[PDB]
Amino acid sequence: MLATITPVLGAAVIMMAFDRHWQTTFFEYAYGGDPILSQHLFWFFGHPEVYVLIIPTF
Amino acid sequence: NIRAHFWSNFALGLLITGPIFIIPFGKAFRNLRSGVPYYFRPKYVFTQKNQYN
Amino acid sequence: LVRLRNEYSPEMDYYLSNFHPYEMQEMGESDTTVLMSPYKYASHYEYTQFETPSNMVYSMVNPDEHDRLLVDPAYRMERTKALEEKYKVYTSSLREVEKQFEERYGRAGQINISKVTYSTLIDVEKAVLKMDRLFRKVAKFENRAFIDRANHSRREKRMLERAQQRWDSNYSFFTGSLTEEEQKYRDYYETELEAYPEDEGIEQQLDQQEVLLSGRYDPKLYDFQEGYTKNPEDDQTSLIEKKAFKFRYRLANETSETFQRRNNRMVERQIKRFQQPQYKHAFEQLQKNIAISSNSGNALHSEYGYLELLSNESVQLYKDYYESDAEEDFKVFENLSSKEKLV
Amino acid sequence: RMTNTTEEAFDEVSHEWQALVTSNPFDLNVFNYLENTQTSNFGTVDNPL
Amino acid sequence: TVINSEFLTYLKSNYKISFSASNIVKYLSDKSVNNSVILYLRKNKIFNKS
Amino acid sequence: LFLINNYKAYKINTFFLYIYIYLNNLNIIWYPIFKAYSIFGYYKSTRLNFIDTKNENIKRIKY
Amino acid sequence: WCAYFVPYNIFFKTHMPLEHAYDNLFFPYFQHTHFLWDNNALHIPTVGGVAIYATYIALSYINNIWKDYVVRAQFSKDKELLFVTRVSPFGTTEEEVYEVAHLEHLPPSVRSGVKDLSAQDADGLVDVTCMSSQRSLVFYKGDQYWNPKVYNDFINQTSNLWTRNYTGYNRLEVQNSVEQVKIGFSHS
Amino acid sequence: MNRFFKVSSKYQYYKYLEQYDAAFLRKYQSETHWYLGRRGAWKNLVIKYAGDHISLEEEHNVKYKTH
Amino acid sequence: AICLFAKFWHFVFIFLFWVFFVLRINELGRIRYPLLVANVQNFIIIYIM
Amino acid sequence: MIWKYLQRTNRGNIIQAGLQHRKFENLPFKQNFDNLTKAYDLRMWYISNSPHEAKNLEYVNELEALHNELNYQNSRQFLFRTVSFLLGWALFYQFYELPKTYDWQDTQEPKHQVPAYGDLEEGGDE
Amino acid sequence: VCGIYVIHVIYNYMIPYYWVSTPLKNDEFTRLRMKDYIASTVLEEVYGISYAEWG
Amino acid sequence: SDPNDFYRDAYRNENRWIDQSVFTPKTSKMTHYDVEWPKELASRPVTKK
Amino acid sequence: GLLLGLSSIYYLMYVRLLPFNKIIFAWILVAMFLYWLLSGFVFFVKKYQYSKFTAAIQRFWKRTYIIFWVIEAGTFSVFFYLTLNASSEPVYMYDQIKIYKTHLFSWRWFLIKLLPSVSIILLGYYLQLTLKWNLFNKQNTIVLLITL
Amino acid sequence: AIRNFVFKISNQIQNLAAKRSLAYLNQIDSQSVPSRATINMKDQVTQMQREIDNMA
Ligand SMILES: CCCCCCCCCCCCCCCCCC(=O)OC[C@H](COP(=O)([O-])OCC(O)COP(=O)([O-])OC[C@@H](COC(=O)CCCCCCCCCCCCCCCCC)OC(=O)CCCCCCCCCCCCCCCCC)OC(=O)CCCCCCCCCCCCCCCCC
Ligand SMILES: CCCCCCCCCCCCCCCCCC(=O)OC[C@H](COP(=O)([O-])OCC(O)COP(=O)([O-])OC[C@@H](COC(=O)CCCCCCCCCCCCCCCCC)OC(=O)CCCCCCCCCCCCCCCCC)OC(=O)CCCCCCCCCCCCCCCCC
Ligand SMILES: CCCCCCCCCCCCCCCCCC(=O)OC[C@H](COP(=O)([O-])OCC(O)COP(=O)([O-])OC[C@@H](COC(=O)CCCCCCCCCCCCCCCCC)OC(=O)CCCCCCCCCCCCCCCCC)OC(=O)CCCCCCCCCCCCCCCCC
Ligand SMILES: CCCCCCCCCCCCCCCCCC(=O)OC[C@H](COP(=O)([O-])OCC(O)COP(=O)([O-])OC[C@@H](COC(=O)CCCCCCCCCCCCCCCCC)OC(=O)CCCCCCCCCCCCCCCCC)OC(=O)CCCCCCCCCCCCCCCCC
Ligand SMILES: CCCCCCCCCCCCCCCCCC(=O)OC[C@H](COP(=O)([O-])OCC[N+](C)(C)C)OC(=O)CCCCCCCCCCCCCCCCC
Ligand SMILES: CCCCCCCCCCCCCCCCCC(=O)OC[C@H](COP(=O)([O-])OCC[N+](C)(C)C)OC(=O)CCCCCCCCCCCCCCCCC
Ligand SMILES: CCCCCCCCCCCCCCCCCC(=O)OC[C@H](COP(=O)([O-])OCC[N+](C)(C)C)OC(=O)CCCCCCCCCCCCCCCCC
Ligand SMILES: CCCCCCCCCCCCCCCCCC(=O)OC[C@H](COP(=O)([O-])OCC[N+](C)(C)C)OC(=O)CCCCCCCCCCCCCCCCC
Ligand SMILES: [Cu+2]
After folding, report:
1. Is B37 helix (H, G, I), strand (E, B) or coil?
2. Is residue F52 within 8 angstroms of chain L, CB to CB?
3. What is the top-level taxon of the source organism (chain F) (predicted)?
């Protein structure tokens, strides 16, 4: 599961860094950015992250 | 109606092309371009082909 | 728990069947790193552009002996020659044991093969021998300068002079399987060719004799069958076709001396028949209209008569060769069909 | 492609080549593939696994 | 190679062959044997069991 | 057939046949094997129809 | 030139991009600037190492390519050793010593490549291999670059392994190609 | 067969070539033993020992170790 | 632009791979199929990218 | 007589094909790719269809040698043809007038080049 | 069950989204409503009033 | 070479005791292996330390 | 090599007047990083030339190579999906020009740019094929051509 | 050079034509295929003439 999900989180975090520093406006609604795209990308990994945390406990 | 016509034409085309093109086309596998009779050339599995031809 | 020991003993050999054979496909050095094919990522090993030699023989050596072999090339050559001699001895002993076993017991059975496959195998053997001879000649021509340096100057001068004489003021018209390169090779190696001409036709006849006398194509060892049939069925060819096959592959079933005797008898009878007046007239008529026949692909009566005489001569040759055979009825040769005559 | 044994075979690779060319049980067991081991019978006193 | 007739007769008299040779080397001809190449394997104590 | 045989001898007629033969000679291809088993493996694979005729497969009970 | 002069002028002496920089891109036209990128100066080790290793590799491979060719060859007194002069990295002379016994002219592994050898031509090159050092000596076939009284002995001594049997055996010499082995003649 | 004719060297050890066929020498010193033919191969043993020993695990080049 | 940055980093990686390979073969004195084919496949992958 | 042409199959369509004797009657005096591949195919077919093991093994060795020779010939052919193709490509693009008059609209984004929202991007009235 | 639900969601919401991507000269509103009806009228958020007495 | 005919006589339940008994077959002794090798093997030097 | 590299490094430092202490500290860290990363591979190459490079080791190295390239391919594929599904403003009024922005590049220009890579891969294949019957010195020409 | 190549082409063409026209006289070809073909052609001609005679 981690192998499946990690690249999505990596891409989302890299895009966040680019928006912060280079001002790529990936998540700026003014000129085409999608703020909800960041949430989608993060949670797509976030829920599998908690599932990964819990599954070994069983 | 178009489906009926198309499938009738497809069956007729199979019947016509059987002896006209594909069977003569099969004569090209009698020998290799070097003149030797056809023999098996495996890719990854050396299948046994003891059966004739 | 079986604690295997690093030794060669019957106790260890007792467990040979309890192991999978070691895979060779993953051994050696691979010229392909990894296959980028999701369809067979775990079904196919990496392919190889080159081939895998199979003429390798391995022998175990001690550490000090291996160090000696590495350090001393002379000792390495000596041990290698000794090992080759011992391998030859071992192979000869195995062959003799196999021959003794065959003599004592007998072959397991007859080989089910088609007559077409048999003929094609013989033809392929002849073609392989011819190609080997051609390759030997070409390699000799290519390596003449490096193998014979003392006479290279004179031989090259002679070859160049002859080639210039041929292609300076004249065209060279080649008949048969003769080419300018082959003529140059013959001119260069004139000396050696005198001792052993190695003529194409004579070599082909001798190699056919060798192939048929090797004994591998003896009809006694084969059960001829159609092959293409769903069920195993005997050969369905006509009686005339069977007789023609037997005559064509006479050498396969006959021994050297018996074949020599029968062939000498047949050739003497054929020579006498040709010396008979009718054949001389037929050949004279054949030669009379050679120029006319060259203007068209159609034949003339003087040639049709010659061909009919050829058919009769073939029938008589078969009869003469198989004269001393009780289980032979020659009446079948009387009033043959057109297809039988062609066969 | 086949390695020159007399020149480069030493220790581990030499033992692997020995297993390949002789199939002696010791070497074959040492270099047996981990993915698959030959299936055997069911262990018994008369015919133990 | 050539084997002396007396030696071969002595071998036949002393031992009677009743089993076939299993090694594929029995099929090798002289040409193949000559074309064969000899290689050496270094055999020593084995310490790695993997 | 008679007309074809009559025109066979003409050199102009045979020029096209010569060109066709030349193209056929230039149209040769090779088909190598690209597996580690290679020629020896293929040869052993093609031995199914002939293994039964070998001496080692003859019935010979040890006892 | 190609690696330093043109890149330097294109990178530092002008802020205007070249056509190959952006013809495949879809940005509006803009200029460059060397002082508003890579604040960490991470490109300094990259450029330095690339330059150093590229120069080293180029020079070393030039030397390797030129090593095979032989400039001068001299037999020692008694003709036991051969002193060979070869090209150095800067085109000067470098000395080496070889043994005539080790020196040998070997045929190619592939027997169909004999016709492709440069030695086939009258003014080609001869590839003599040192079987001890696994080195190759290249000599011009032209008679100009040869001493005409020590050439026959040299070629005879260095061309022993290129024999007639390299081309194969006919049916007259197939039997003699190997030495027959006698078994059991000395004892039963 | 084409046996090696003679060795014009004062070193009697080199005369071993005279006892072998040219084809044998090509097979075992030129085709597949080219890197091993008529060579000491002591460097092979030295490199084997260097590789198999437990020496310092800091390598700079194939020839030298890190300073 | 981000994809092209990734492509450039991959190309730098394969360039370093090739530099390492050439230096090692120069030191050894001969080329080897494993590393040579690895470099060839790296070139193919970079061409694809 | 339609059956005589439909249900009747030619003898060659069923029986094994023979050896083309014209392919071997006359051959050049050069040990070239054509002759090498002809010999390779002959030996391969003989190994496939032969019951004689003694002849096959020597044929196996000769076939390995022929495989090496054909690999060398193919390497030469590949080198020559690839070099010719690359040189032809380079010369074609050197002597070919590449069109440089394609539409450049894609490179222009007037709204993005000159922000049309102005100060409203940083925030509205209050 | 999840796959069938996802297939239905795709058929209703994903593929139809690409049918119209530019202004349409003729019957633009009609086509937009045609593509929107299948997605906005799914029974999941429509059915239930028939048994409203349950709650 | 009939497989069933061979097997029915080769493998039997009443011969189990002698079918799986390991032994050294009677073969002519070889000096290099059965005479010389044991002598050199037993003549190896022995060191206390 | 040393002359050119040192000159380039000093010029690039001087043009922007980097702080020496901080930059030298960073470059020391980077040097140690890269040096040890490459020294691991140097050790692997030096150790596997005798008695260590077995079939299992070769398969392991092939697997590592494919795994690395697979991870890189996965990351690049995620980025490629993001590129393909890049968001944009509504086409009706906000951005009406999006319809005519196809961003199509000329193949007549792409092929010439693509030529060098195919040249390199073909040269590499030729070197691989020719390694069976050629020496190191003779193939240095192909190696140098590929390097250039 | 050019003249030699042209003559070689002409020689090969002439040899091919001579073979096609007179291969039925000798046994160079295995199985005497051209000879059998010529014999079959004569047989067919004679059979056609005899068929006309028998119809009459
Ligand atoms: C409903 C449609 C839905 C999808 C939409 C439509 C399709 C869209 C396009 C799909 C394809 C992508 C486009 C490029 C295709 C290129 C094909 C090619 O060049 O290779 C053909 C290649 C055949 O060439 P070949 O190897 O030379 O031929 C055999 C030789 O004799 C080799 O000889 P040998 O000696 O080396 O080996 C001998 C032996 C071994 O050789 C092999 O073939 C090797 C083993 C092959 C195993 C294949 C299955 C395992 C796949 C592994 C993973 C693949 C990727 C998975 C990705 C998703 C992971 C989650 O031969 C065989 O066994 C041959 C069998 C091949 C038959 C294939 C027939 C079609 C499939 C049905 C198979 C049924 C089997 C029999 C049962 C019959 C029914 C009861 O492979 C096939 O034809 C089979 C491929 C099967 C896997 C397909 C995976 C597709 C992945 C992309 C999906 C895209 C998205 C789809 C929608 C979903 C979005 C989320
Ligand atoms: C309309 C469709 C087509 C449009 C094409 C438009 C043009 C695009 C050109 C772009 C490339 C430029 C030219 C490059 C030349 C390269 C030459 C070369 O040496 O390459 C041949 C080289 C020969 O292979 P080899 O290892 O030497 O020998 C194999 C044997 O011969 C055994 O032979 P085999 O045939 O059985 O197997 C080999 C086969 C294997 O290839 C195929 O069967 C694929 C054929 C269709 C290619 C389509 C190109 C891309 C088109 C746009 C994207 C559409 C979706 C594609 C989805 C399917 C994957 C392609 O190769 C071929 O089919 C030969 C032609 C391949 C052309 C180059 C393909 C570039 C692929 C780029 C993407 C790679 C990463 C994708 C990851 C998955 C993303 C969803 O193979 C490749 O390089 C092809 C690699 C393909 C990898 C596909 C991976 C699929 C995913 C599987 C794992 C999924 C895990 C999921 C985990 C997470 C789940 C949540
Ligand atoms: C419009 C639709 C398409 C058709 C037209 C195409 C364009 C025009 C083509 C014109 C060709 C014919 C020119 C007149 C020839 C007159 C010959 C002569 O005096 O009679 C000797 C001969 C009499 O001698 P005889 O001792 O009684 O019997 C000897 C036998 O015939 C046994 O003799 P044989 O048959 O073995 O003779 C072979 C012949 C030749 O030997 C060969 O068979 C070897 C192959 C040689 C080349 C053959 C083709 C040459 C023409 C085409 C070239 C195409 C190049 C393309 C280049 C690339 C373009 C992108 O020997 C020679 O005559 C030696 C000549 C060697 C030099 C050749 C070069 C000549 C100069 C080049 C320019 C030619 C005119 C160009 C006009 C403009 C074209 C645009 O004539 C006969 O056999 C009976 C007929 C006599 C009256 C003929 C009246 C004229 C009508 C002739 C029609 C021939 C048609 C052939 C083709 C049929 C379809 C496949
Ligand atoms: C302190 C930080 C660093 C400062 C460096 C300053 C610049 C120095 C340049 C020197 C260049 C080499 C000169 C060698 C001459 C001697 C050659 C010789 O005799 O051969 C022996 C041997 C080489 O043998 P060989 O047979 O000649 O080699 C031939 C091979 O084919 C050749 O193969 P190989 O030997 O090179 O093999 C080693 C292998 C192993 O790889 C390496 O060597 C790694 C190289 C890393 C370089 C990093 C440079 C960073 C600093 C840049 C400049 C700083 C400012 C400088 C000052 C201002 C400007 C003037 O190298 C590679 O293959 C590298 C591949 C290419 C990569 C290039 C660099 C990376 C580019 C891509 C990424 C760049 C962005 C960063 C990305 C990462 C971010 C985290 O050399 C050695 O063992 C080293 C030198 C001799 C021993 C040391 C003697 C002095 C004592 C040590 C003093 C310093 C340390 C202790 C200080 C404290 C004392 C108390
Ligand atoms: C955009 C630019 C283009 C891209 C540029 C980069 C291109 C890189 C090309 C090279 C690398 C990729 C090559 C193709 C892939 C090769 C894979 C491979 O060989 O790996 C074998 C590796 C190693 O295999 P191995 O080591 O056993 O291989 C040896 C095999 N034998 C022994 C037979 C020789 O293992 C695998 O990864 C295979 C098993 C896993 C495969 C994936 C299964 C699915 C996992 C997820 C579960 C499902 C989730 C839901 C999916 C559906 C969602 C909708
Ligand atoms: C790393 C390789 C192995 C692993 C493979 C996988 C790696 C994938 C990494 C990327 C993943 C996806 C995220 C992308 C992030 C991109 C970040 C980015 O763009 O930063 C770059 C940054 C730019 O960042 P920046 O902050 O300066 O950006 C400028 C923009 N503003 C002003 C808005 C901040 O640049 C560098 O890091 C410097 C790179 C220097 C390269 C030098 C190469 C020299 C070549 C020399 C040879 C050529 C000939 C000349 C020789 C002369 C010799 C004298
Ligand atoms: C072998 C027995 C076969 C039995 C026949 C039924 C199964 C056939 C095969 C499976 C597909 C079933 C699809 C049913 C729905 C088709 C239409 C559709 O999607 O829209 C209606 C509805 C959607 O309705 P709607 O909201 O779009 O309404 C359309 C009308 N307006 C717009 C006016 C409101 O589909 C769903 O709601 C799908 C929900 C997901 C779960 C569906 C489960 C179906 C029943 C269980 C099937 C189990 C099969 C097991 C097979 C293996 C074991 C035997
Ligand atoms: C700013 C730019 C980027 C900065 C980052 C710097 C990146 C540097 C990358 C260097 C890569 C060097 C690779 C060398 C591989 C050597 C393999 C070896 O030991 O040989 C095995 C062997 C060597 O074989 P051989 O040919 O030498 O000999 C075998 C032995 N005989 C000949 C006797 C039989 O090779 C193989 O098995 C072939 C396949 C090799 C596959 C190698 C994969 C390497 C993967 C590296 C991943 C790196 C990740 C980096 C992450 C990011 C870092 C910042
Ligand atoms: Cu959740």
Report:
1. strand
2. yes
3. Eukaryota
Residues near M7 by beta carbon (within 8 Å), at least 6 away in sequence: none
What is the spatial distance between Cα G183 and Cα H9, in angstroms, rounded to a whole number? 36
Nearest-atom number in ligand 4 for the CA of H66 is: 83
**What amino acid occupies position C192?**
E
* Residue contact C10–L1, C-beta within 8 A: no
Residues near M49 by Cβ (< 8 Å), separated by ≥ 6? H47, H51, I28
Residues A10, M74: C-beta atoms closer than 8 Å: no
Element (H, E) at C205: helix C200-213
Nearest to M128 by CA among G78, I35, C6: I35
F46–chain N nearest CA distance, Å: 30
From CA G130, how far away is CA G98, in angstroms rounded?
Answer: 8
> Which residue, K26, J24, J50, G172, is CA-closest to C114?
J50
Mutation choice for ligand 8 from M45, M66, M136, CB with most ligand atoms inside 8 A: M45
d(CA C202, CA C207): 9
- Whole-angstrom Cα distance, residue D17 to residue C24? 10
For atom 33 of ligand 8, which residue has the closest CA?
M49
Sole residue written with tokens 């993953």? C26
3-state secondary structure at position B21: helix
At a CB cut-off of 8 Å and minimum separation 6, what does D44 contact? none
Distance CA N55, CA C135 (A): 61
Edge-to-edge, what's the strand order for the sheet holding G103-104?
G103-104, G125-130, G135-140
C60 — contact with chain D (CB < 8 Å)?
yes
3-state secondary structure (DSSP) of residue B31: strand
> What H or E segment, with its residue span, contains residue J77?
helix J53-95
Q: What is the rounded CA–CA span in Å between residue G171 and residue J74?
A: 32
For residues J30 and J37, the answer to whether their CB atoms sit within 8 Å is no
Question: CA–CA separation, J40 vs J34, rounded Å?
Answer: 10
Contacts of H54 (CB under 8 A, 6+ apart): none
**Inter-CA distances, H65 with H60, H62, I27, N46, Å:** 5, 8, 13, 96
- Angle at the Cα of C55 from the Cα atoms of C49 and C56, rounded to 5 degrees: 95
Least Cα separation, residue C57 to chain E (angstroms)? 5
List the chains bordering chain N where 3 or more Cβ pairs fall under 8 Å.
Answer: C, F
Q: How far is the CA of C37 from the centre of ligand 2 (A)?
A: 7
Provide the β-strand partners of residue C56: E37
Distance (Å, rounded) from C-alpha F50 to C-alpha L25? Answer: 31
Resolution given for this structure, in angstroms: 2.6
CA I4/CA G38 separation, integer angstroms: 17
Nearest-angstrom CA–CA distance, C341 and J40: 37
Burial F30-45 (b: 16+ CB within 10 A, else e): bebbbbbbbbbbbbeb
Alpha carbon distance A27, A37 (integer Å): 7
**Helices in N1-56 by DSSP H: which ranges?**
2-22, 33-55
- The answer for residues whose C-beta is within 8 angstroms of residue N29's C-beta and 6 or more apart is J21, N23
CA gap C136, G164 in Å, rounded: 11
Look at residue C15 and give its three-state secondary structure.
coil
**Does M146 contact I18 at a Cβ distance shorter than 8 Å?**
yes
For the beta carbon of residue C16, count every other beta carbon within 10 angstroms. Answer: 11
Going from the Cα of H58 to the center of ligand 4, the distance in angstroms, rounded, reads 14
- Return all residues near B39 (Cβ < 8 A) that are at least 6 apart: B32, J41, J44, J45, J48, J49
The rounded distance, in Å, linking the Cα atoms of I12 and I18 is: 10
Gaps (C–N > 2.5 Å) in chain H: which residues precede them? Answer: none
Q: Which two tokens stand for residue J111?
A: 């709204």
Contacts of C67 in chain H (CB under 8 A): 45
